[PDB]
Amino acid sequence: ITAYSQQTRGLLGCIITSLTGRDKNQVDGEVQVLSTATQSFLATCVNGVCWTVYHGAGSKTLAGPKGPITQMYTNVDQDLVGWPAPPGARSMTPCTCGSSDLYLVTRHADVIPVRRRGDSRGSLLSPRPVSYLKGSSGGPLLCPSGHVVGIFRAAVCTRGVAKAVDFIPVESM
Amino acid sequence: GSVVIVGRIILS
Ligand SMILES: *[C@](O)(C(=O)O)[C@@H](CC(F)F)NC(=O)[C@@H](CC(C)C)NC(=O)[C@@]1(Cc2ccsc2C(=O)O)Cc2ccccc2N1
Numbered sequence: 229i230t231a232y233s234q235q236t237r238g239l240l241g242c243i244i245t246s247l248t249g250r251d252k253n254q255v256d257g258e259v260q261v262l263s264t265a266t267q268s269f270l271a272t273c274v275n276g277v278c279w280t281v282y283h284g285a286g287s288k289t290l291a292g293p294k295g296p297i298t299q300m301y302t303n304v305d306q307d308l309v310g311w312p313a314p315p316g317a318r319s320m321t322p323c324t325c326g327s328s329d330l331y332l333v334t335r336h337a338d339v340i341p342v343r344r345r346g347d348s349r350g351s352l353l354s355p356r357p358v359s360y361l362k363g364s365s366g367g368p369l370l371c372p373s374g375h376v377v378g379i380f381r382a383a384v385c386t387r388g389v390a391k392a393v394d395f396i397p398v399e400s401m
Numbered sequence: 402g403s404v405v406i407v408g409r410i411i412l413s
Contacts, residue, residue: 230413237407246402257409264404280404291403314406337410367410374412 229370231337249289249296255316259333259368270335270366272379273317274401277310280366281381285309306400307381322398323375330377331370335363348378348397358385369395
């Protein structure tokens with residue numbers, strides 16, 4: 229698995245788009261880099277829904293070509309929200325080959341190995357600074373074949389080093 | 402206001 233990223237907006241434009249709800253940029257790729265005023269996170273497109281963490285998006289709309297997109301799925305207890313994916317996003321497919329060495333795609337488009345530990349827990353195969361994972365919530369956890377098994381929720385860390393991640397299973401989507 | 406897409410990640 230490889231990844232590369234492409235910024236599409238700067239600061240002024242993010243701000244105004246948030247107030248208008250109206251996104252006329254052409255959308256593409258599997259994973260959207262999102263921002264509000266408060267934070268920046270990711271959304272994984274899986275079966276034509278853009279998914280992301282509830283602790284990031286809250287219950288807010290997603291700016292779209294025609295104006296704000298209402299959440300179609302809002303689960304506060306699973307920390308999961310979903311918007312109808314904007315046209316152009318590349319939709320991933322949920323894994324089922326059931327592999328257990330997994331791949332976390334970050335905001336910096338690195339692709340870090342994660343050992344599946346349980347339904348929605350993983351251990352990093354080599355420690356990263358947690359700072360490096362900041363902004364990656366919502367990102368995809370991939371199996372070797374490129375399918376999605378979930379989206380990053382939370383890093384478990386001590387003294388600044390992320391050892392394990394918590395994730396929301398694709399199952400729950 | 403809205404959540405805004407400010408970039409993307411392409412998967413290979
Ligand atoms: C995601 O929102 C993002 O930043 O893109 C990640 C952030 C990253 F992994 F750190 N999710 C969060 O940042 C958190 C949101 C919670 C409601 C789940 N929580 C954590 O990941 C957590 C680790 C961490 C983040 C910032 S400082 C820090 C830490 O562990 O010191 C914060 C936290 C507080 C209390 C108990 C557990 C955690 N995990």
